[PDB]
Amino acid sequence: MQEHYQPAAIEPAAQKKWDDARISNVSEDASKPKYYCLSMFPYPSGKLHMGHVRNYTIGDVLSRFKLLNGFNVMQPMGWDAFGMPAENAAMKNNVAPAAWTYDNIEYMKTQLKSLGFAVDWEREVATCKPEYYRWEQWLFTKLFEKGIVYRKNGTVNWDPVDQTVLANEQVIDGRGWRSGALIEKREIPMYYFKITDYAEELLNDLDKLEHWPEQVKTMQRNWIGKSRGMTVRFAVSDDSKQGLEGDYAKFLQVYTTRPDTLMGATYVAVAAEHPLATAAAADKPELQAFIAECKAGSVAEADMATMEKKGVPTGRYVVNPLNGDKLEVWIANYVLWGYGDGAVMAVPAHDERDFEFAAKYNLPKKQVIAVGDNAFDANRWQEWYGDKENGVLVNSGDLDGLDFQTAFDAVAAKLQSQGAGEPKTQYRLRDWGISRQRYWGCPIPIVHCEKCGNVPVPADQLPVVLPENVVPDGMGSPLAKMPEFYETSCPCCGGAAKRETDTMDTFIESSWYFFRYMSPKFSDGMVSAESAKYWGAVDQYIGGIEHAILHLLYARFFTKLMRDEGLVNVDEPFERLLTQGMVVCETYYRENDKGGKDWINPADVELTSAVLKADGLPVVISGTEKMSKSKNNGVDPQELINAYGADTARLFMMFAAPPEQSLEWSDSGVEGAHRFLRRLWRTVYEYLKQGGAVKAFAGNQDGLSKELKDLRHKLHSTTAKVSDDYGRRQQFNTAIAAVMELLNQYDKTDTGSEQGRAVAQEVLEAAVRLLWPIVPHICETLWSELNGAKLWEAGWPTVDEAALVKSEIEVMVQVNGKLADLEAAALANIIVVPGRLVNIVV
Ligand SMILES: CC(C)C[C@H](N)C(=O)NS(=O)(=O)OC[C@H]1OC[C@@H](CCCn2cc(CNC(=O)NCc3ccccc3)nn2)[C@H](O)[C@@H]1O
Ligand SMILES: [Mg+2]
Ligand SMILES: [Zn+2]
């Protein structure tokens, strides 16, 4: 054993020892209990970043621990390969997106392997391969024939200078983000998943996820957004029926979740597309301009509630069906056509948006809800205005005194008797649009024929292959410009026909890949039935919080789709879910001779102030934020590995913060992690150079010294602490601190005697197994110096409950014949014959 710790000498050999033993290459062996530990697979970006290393180290800690506990552990890895990154890299570099993607995959694979993740590489998938995406084309055709996937015209933001479609996230002040050109709203046919057919299942099944963070579940519930309310029809006043036709001339129908406040409605509001808006804007230009601004908006949903609410009176009136009050109709920008009836009622006394709106326009507020002897101020909003559970109705004639649920029913009966309304369940959830006007994505398996319509490609003709021999030029989606791809024959009638040129939303690949990993070379279906039966669901999923809504919902949806097709037998893909925090770092800048800032990379700055590393001109240290190319503050993990080895990188990431907390880059803390590894190395080297290995202490410990009993207490306390930090808390930094404390006590204990060595052997053999999930290379190497058994069949350390009982302090006591450290406990009820009796001289 070399005296100095040299990670490049040891990490390659340890990796070849794990690979030679095929310990991460698992099969469906019904003899070992399974465990499926999954980290969210990466985009083949080019190179790993520190978020990648944080995530896959967390995955590896948990997989290695469960493996050491005897589980058949599958930890798979692959590549979320489609999407815009490669398309833009292709445009800028004059290279095919596929060629760029496959080179990135090859490089990033090398990096992952060198970090020593215990990954089953025989299960690798790449989603841009036809061996992969044919199976989502297959599922699509099945759901298309069932109406679960359907085609319908929708509205997109068209950028006419860049000749491509943009999401609302890419529209700033009505303009394209790169081009700066005004976007055009266009109606085009697109494809949708009927996810709203499964809304109630997706909402309720969340309740089975006892090992999910409540915040993720609550975020899903808000997105689905179920409400039970009331449809209410307000009759249109005779004076307001001009330009209306059909049911819109007779009534304005609305949806509300608060029918118990219908006596408090002081006005109604309609979307800009609503026929009432159209009819009243006919002669009023300010209304026309307000309607146009609403249509031109591109407010992303994450920003919807933040937009400033605005409205315009129409001069048309409807009649409240419970009290006959005539309310003015307003066009408002927060009422969205396609949600419900595109019209709402407004109660400023008990809904805060209605309060702020009515306060803006001086619209009236009528209190109808009381909560205790609380005063009602019509000019200031108090939180109890919105209380549903503890309110009672006031100012509502027949309904005064009722609580929420009784009044809801009373209103329902009143409205139904009248023909004016009925209970109604609604969901904020929209159907899922999967059409993308992009080249680098999975082709949609549809052929368009003027005789037969939109026809699915039959199963025998899948995949529809995306041609890899393409270089996007910017001027529009390539597939629409390639007759060699879209010109075909109709599979139903044989006649002239055209393939669909839109590709799929890339969320589709990531909605089922965890099942594909179960049988990644299966060519007769999405996932083999035998391997789905064995692996079941993912036991532990690890990933970033930005995927808590869309990706998770989509995966849960696809799992229930696949379940209903007969392919899988679970309701939920993910049992345990762990959300890792961001990785952030200091920023540095010089100022520009244009009044701006040039963001410098940390690698080219030295500290003391701070300046360049090759130069000496100072920089300006500024704030800490998530690593990103925007402020040039990303720290390249390959240079951290080059400088210190993989074990140091993995230890720093786990020690620096709990996985949920944001991790702050620290040169100082990276050096602390390395020196701790050096210390682990030296501790074992020094122990072995003073006598060589011995049989680890085991068994009855009566007759060990006090000092060595104490070390065994700390030893077995550490084992239970660590096990509970890996298994229960998932708090890997406290488990490292625990092992450091154990080595501190060992450093202060004399282990020179014969029984001393046996306890030191025990301590050290436990320490390196306890830390093997975090830094497996050095622990594998040191374990081989201490003990000749395979580390992984030695298995996780066991707690010795005997070493936790602390030995008895037993004696009797007597005041006047009749029944410092003992005289202090025995006065808590003065001779003291050593050990047996305490006599208290009365
Ligand atoms: C399931 C599927 C939908 C997954 C999809 N393929 C995906 O999200 N794929 S992915 O590849 O994005 O990530 C894969 C996983 O692992 C990394 C996690 C990173 C969180 C963000 N995050 C980033 C950072 C720190 N950033 C850096 O170090 N930037 C360095 C840099 C600077 C300058 C230029 C280049 C690089 N901290 N947290 C991420 O949530 C996820 O769990
Ligand atoms: Mg359960
Ligand atoms: Zn045809």
Side-chain angles (χ1 to χ4, degrees), residues 1 3-91 93-128 130-141 143-144 146-172 174-177 179-213 215-244 246-292 294-365 367-370 372 374-379 381-388 390-520 522-529 531-532 534-593 595-605 608 610 612 614-616 618 622-628 630-694 696-705 707-753 755-809 813-814 817 820-822 824-826 828-829 833-835 837-838 840 842:
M1 172 176 181
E3 160 180 40
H4 289 100
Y5 161 60
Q6 186 32 264
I10 78 160
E11 293 176 353
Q15 297 168 2
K16 191 255 204 179
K17 169 152 131 189
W18 295 323
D19 303 350
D20 283 5
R22 300 183 44 83
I23 68 174
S24 317
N25 303 129
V26 291
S27 83
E28 289 88 43
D29 156 73
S31 147
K32 274 220 271 314
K34 69 106 189 183
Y35 191 84
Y36 186 172
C37 182
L38 178 58
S39 284
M40 285 182 188
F41 65 126
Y43 304 124
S45 185
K47 51 187 211 293
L48 307 181
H49 57 63
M50 291 285 197
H52 287 142
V53 173
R54 185 160 203 210
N55 204 97
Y56 305 134
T57 306
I58 293 172
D60 204 48
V61 168
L62 291 170
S63 315
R64 278 170 184 283
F65 165 70
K66 283 290 180 149
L67 158 71
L68 277 196
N69 269 270
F71 283 88
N72 196 20
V73 173
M74 181 173 81
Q75 190 184 203
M77 205 98 193
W79 318 95
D80 200 345
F82 276 137
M84 275 299 309
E87 214 165 324
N88 283 327
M91 256 157 39
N93 292 350
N94 196 25
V95 47
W100 184 88
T101 298
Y102 292 131
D103 291 340
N104 293 353
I105 277 169
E106 166 193 66
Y107 188 80
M108 291 164 92
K109 187 181 185 162
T110 296
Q111 303 192 284
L112 289 174
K113 270 166 166 293
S114 64
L115 279 161
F117 298 133
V119 160
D120 191 342
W121 286 109
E122 291 174 341
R123 291 168 188 275
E124 192 179 2
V125 304
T127 66
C128 58
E131 292 77 356
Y132 184 91
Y133 59 70
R134 63 175 302 191
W135 295 116
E136 59 200 34
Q137 293 178 336
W138 178 87
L139 183 55
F140 185 114
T141 64
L143 296 174
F144 195 78
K146 279 152 129 47
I148 296 275
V149 173
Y150 64 95
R151 189 182 185 254
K152 190 188 211 177
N153 281 353
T155 300
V156 296
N157 314 302
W158 175 253
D159 181 321
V161 171
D162 276 1
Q163 299 289 300
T164 181
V165 169
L166 300 176
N168 294 6
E169 296 71 40
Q170 332 182 256
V171 177
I172 309 138
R175 294 184 185 264
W177 70 332
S179 79
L182 284 161
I183 70 100
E184 319 184 346
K185 263 76 169 68
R186 291 195 175 185
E187 255 208 355
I188 65 177
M190 285 175 312
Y191 299 94
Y192 299 85
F193 271 98
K194 208 174 181 164
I195 194 161
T196 59
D197 263 10
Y198 290 69
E200 179 87 14
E201 216 172 324
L202 283 150
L203 170 58
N204 293 329
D205 281 356
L206 280 162
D207 294 3
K208 326 170 140 167
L209 297 171
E210 309 187 30
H211 295 82
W212 277 37
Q215 65 154 348
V216 177
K217 299 191 277 178
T218 290
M219 270 180 265
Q220 304 243 329
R221 292 186 181 111
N222 286 318
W223 186 265
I224 305 184
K226 175 186 187 174
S227 57
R228 226 282 194 261
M230 201 84 75
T231 299
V232 192
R233 287 179 285 279
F234 298 61
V236 167
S237 312
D238 272 331
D239 60 5
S240 309
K241 286 155 177 267
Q242 278 288 297
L244 305 168
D247 284 1
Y248 295 92
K250 293 167 282 233
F251 57 74
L252 171 85
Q253 185 159 281
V254 305
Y255 178 77
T256 172
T257 55
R258 304 286 320 254
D260 67 299
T261 67
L262 177 56
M263 296 304 217
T266 59
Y267 60 97
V268 299
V270 306
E273 292 87 346
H274 191 281
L276 267 174
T278 296
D283 78 317
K284 300 186 197 62
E286 173 62 38
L287 270 63
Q288 296 161 15
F290 182 88
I291 285 174
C294 282
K295 295 188 170 186
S298 322
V299 182
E301 155 68 12
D303 307 319
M304 192 53 61
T306 297
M307 91 166 165
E308 192 143 290
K309 300 84 81 195
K310 305 184 147 300
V312 68
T314 69
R316 310 290 194 99
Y317 295 90
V318 292
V319 173
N320 182 326
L322 252 69
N323 60 24
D325 278 343
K326 244 173 63 161
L327 321 179
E328 189 154 19
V329 178
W330 280 63
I331 312 151
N333 67 350
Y334 68 87
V335 182
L336 311 166
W337 194 242
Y339 281 75
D341 306 283
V344 301
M345 78 183 208
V347 191
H350 309 287
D351 172 284
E352 197 194 331
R353 180 166 65 194
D354 291 340
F355 191 94
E356 277 168 20
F357 191 96
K360 186 176 184 170
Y361 301 117
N362 190 203
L363 289 163
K365 311 180 175 106
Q367 172 182 14
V368 280
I369 302 281
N374 292 358
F376 174 87
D377 192 332
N379 294 326
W381 168 268
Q382 292 162 290
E383 185 138 287
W384 71 261
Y385 291 179
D387 192 328
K388 281 160 65 155
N390 314 132
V392 153
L393 258 69
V394 297
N395 305 322
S396 311
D398 315 336
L399 309 160
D400 287 355
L402 317 182
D403 57 46
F404 168 81
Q405 179 45 70
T406 58
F408 185 115
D409 299 338
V411 174
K414 275 178 204 269
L415 294 166
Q416 261 178 281
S417 295
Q418 217 172 102
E422 59 272 334
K424 175 78 173 319
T425 297
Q426 294 263 286
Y427 301 91
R428 296 211 312 139
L429 186 69
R430 307 294 98 188
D431 281 337
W432 175 15
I434 63 98
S435 287
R436 293 310 180 257
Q437 290 69 209
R438 311 280 177 256
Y439 154 72
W440 184 240
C442 162
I444 284 161
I446 290 281
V447 169
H448 309 285
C449 160
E450 279 304 320
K451 173 146 291 213
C452 316
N454 325 119
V455 183
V457 180
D460 308 332
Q461 309 290 84
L462 293 178
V464 177
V465 176
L466 181 78
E468 305 214 314
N469 178 46
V470 172
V471 178
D473 65 21
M475 334 189 275
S477 100
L479 284 186
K481 299 157 64 187
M482 287 157 66
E484 62 272 27
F485 169 83
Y486 64 76
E487 308 256 62
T488 196
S489 69
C490 170
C492 289
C493 82
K498 287 188 192 336
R499 305 206 174 276
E500 171 70 48
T501 52
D502 285 345
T503 49
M504 284 180 204
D505 184 358
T506 45
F507 275 122
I508 285 199
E509 294 87 57
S510 53
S511 309
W512 74 284
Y513 72 109
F514 40 91
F515 284 133
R516 188 49 178 189
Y517 283 144
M518 305 181 174
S519 57
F522 191 58
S523 60
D524 281 316
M526 296 200 89
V527 49
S528 97
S531 74
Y534 176 84
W535 293 109
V538 173
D539 291 285
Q540 179 77 70
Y541 202 32
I542 309 138
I545 195 54
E546 77 270 18
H547 287 303
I549 308 183
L550 295 180
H551 162 51
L552 288 188
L553 188 73
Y554 293 158
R556 301 179 51 231
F557 178 46
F558 255 58
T559 296
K560 299 182 205 301
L561 291 173
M562 296 178 57
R563 184 212 49 205
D564 296 337
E565 278 313 313
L567 322 187
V568 296
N569 281 304
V570 297
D571 294 334
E572 291 287 327
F574 311 125
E575 281 288 323
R576 283 156 205 98
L577 172 71
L578 188 154
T579 288
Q580 62 141 55
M582 296 177 306
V583 174
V584 304
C585 175
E586 200 165 10
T587 54
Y588 308 82
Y589 78 93
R590 207 105 83 190
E591 264 161 30
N592 259 320
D593 263 38
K597 299 171 187 63
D598 312 319
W599 299 94
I600 322 280
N601 188 274
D604 315 316
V605 169
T608 325
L612 302 212
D615 189 307
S622 42
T624 301
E625 63 173 44
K626 178 197 166 168
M627 297 182 170
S628 76
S630 100
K631 292 192 161 101
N632 195 16
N633 65 323
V635 174
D636 187 357
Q638 186 61 54
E639 273 293 78
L640 169 62
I641 295 171
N642 284 351
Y644 297 94
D647 274 345
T648 295
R650 296 169 57 131
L651 188 74
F652 168 67
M653 306 214 74
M654 303 302 99
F655 193 68
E660 265 98 19
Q661 224 180 282
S662 294
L663 196 141
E664 224 188 338
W665 177 251
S666 167
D667 280 331
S668 148
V670 160
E671 316 174 7
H674 196 69
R675 276 193 330 266
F676 170 76
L677 292 184
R678 275 190 178 123
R679 160 180 178 186
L680 195 69
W681 192 265
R682 167 191 329 121
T683 305
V684 176
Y685 170 91
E686 279 179 12
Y687 161 80
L688 292 175
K689 178 191 249 242
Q690 193 92 31
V694 303
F697 180 94
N700 168 27
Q701 76 160 16
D702 299 357
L704 261 205
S705 57
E707 302 85 340
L708 301 185
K709 285 177 151 148
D710 286 336
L711 185 53
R712 291 197 79 229
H713 184 99
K714 188 69 179 175
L715 163 53
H716 293 283
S717 99
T718 298
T719 288
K721 174 84 195 316
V722 169
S723 308
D724 202 80
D725 280 357
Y726 288 170
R728 178 155 81 63
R729 271 191 288 277
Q730 292 167 354
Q731 215 204 333
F732 311 104
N733 57 329
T734 54
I736 305 167
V739 176
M740 293 169 43
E741 275 159 28
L742 164 68
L743 281 159
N744 291 328
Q745 165 132 359
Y746 165 98
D747 283 339
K748 306 195 227 128
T749 309
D750 177 3
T751 48
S753 77
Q755 68 190 226
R757 307 272 301 159
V759 166
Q761 186 84 19
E762 206 199 347
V763 173
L764 303 187
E765 277 175 12
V768 295
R769 296 188 290 163
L770 284 178
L771 285 164
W772 191 77
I774 301 208
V775 281
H777 314 80
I778 191 169
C779 288
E780 193 79 45
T781 304
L782 301 173
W783 171 266
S784 68
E785 293 299 333
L786 292 161
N787 187 306
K790 323 262 211 54
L791 180 142
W792 48 85
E793 311 259 321
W796 191 245
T798 59
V799 169
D800 191 340
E801 280 166 81
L804 302 184
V805 315
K806 284 187 154 282
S807 211
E808 200 104 66
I809 308 319
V813 287
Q814 60 176 264
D821 55 288
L822 294 110
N829 314 355
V833 153
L837 173 159
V838 200
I840 38 176
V842 278

